[PDB]
Amino acid sequence: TGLDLGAASSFGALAPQGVANAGATVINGDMGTTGTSITGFPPGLITGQLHINDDTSTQAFADSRTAFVAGQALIATVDQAGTATLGGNTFVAGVYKYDSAVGLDGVLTLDGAGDASSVWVFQLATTLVTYASSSIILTNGAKANNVFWIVGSSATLGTYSHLEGNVIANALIAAQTGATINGALLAGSAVTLDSNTVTVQNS
């Protein structure tokens, strides 16, 4: 249902070049790297399995990149061209193409329109920045596990923000103080965390 994440599907945080944590983070999911050590656990903790450079982390990373490539290759159903803002919108299922840096200030609503099989793929050509206390919400049967944020460079999740979905970034994912995620942080470089909660979702 949407992009196949393969062995990456159980990970809350996956980054080849490490996960660097500050504060009382809780990862409800697996965590891995391709060999780089993680730092800041404790005081962080994970409730799933740690996979630092084993067969699972190699296959999970490869699968995360396969999904990134497939996500970028999809034909857009909605061309948003140079639109810079996501906040204050209600989006039905689609592949949404954004050509430049996007921000989310306020609330974004993902409307399943009564169909739980609804898929969202956000094709963000460069950066994603979510603002402080921003939120993504699900209505009318939308499922977090069917939402994909395909971030063309790096994602910055703002302080005390809330995100639903699978963040598949080409490079860095930074979750600022208190950001919460129902989904996953699948980075192409590093993940930085500060007092976050990440909970992996199923569909």
Numbering used by the authors: 1 to 203
What did the publication describing this PDB structure actually write?
Here we present new structural data for an IBP identified from a cold-tolerant fungus, Antarctomyces psychrotrophicus (AnpIBP). The structure of AnpIBP consists of a 45-Å-long β-helical fold with a triangular cross section. The main constituents are 6-ladder β-helical loops, which are supported by a long α-helix located along the β-helical axis. The AnpIBP uniquely binds to the water molecules that participate in the primary and secondary prism planes, which were detected as a prism ring in the FIPA experiment.
An asymmetric unit contains six AnpIBP molecules. The final model of AnpIBP shows the structural coordinates of 203 out of 216 amino acid residues. When we identified the water molecules whose oxygen atoms are proximal to each other within 3.5 Å to be connected with a hydrogen bond, a total of 88 water molecules were displayed on the solvent-exposed IBS. The molecules are mainly organized into polygonal arrangements similarly to those observed in Maxi, which extend over the left and right sides of the IBS in AnpIBP. The presence of four regularly arrayed hollows was identified in the IBS of AnpIBP. The distance between the first and second hollows and between the third and fourth hollows is 4.6 Å, and that between the first and third hollows and between the second and fourth hollows is 14.7 Å. These intervals perfectly match the oxygen atom distance in the primary and secondary prism planes (4.6 and 14.7 Å) as well as that comprising the prism ring.
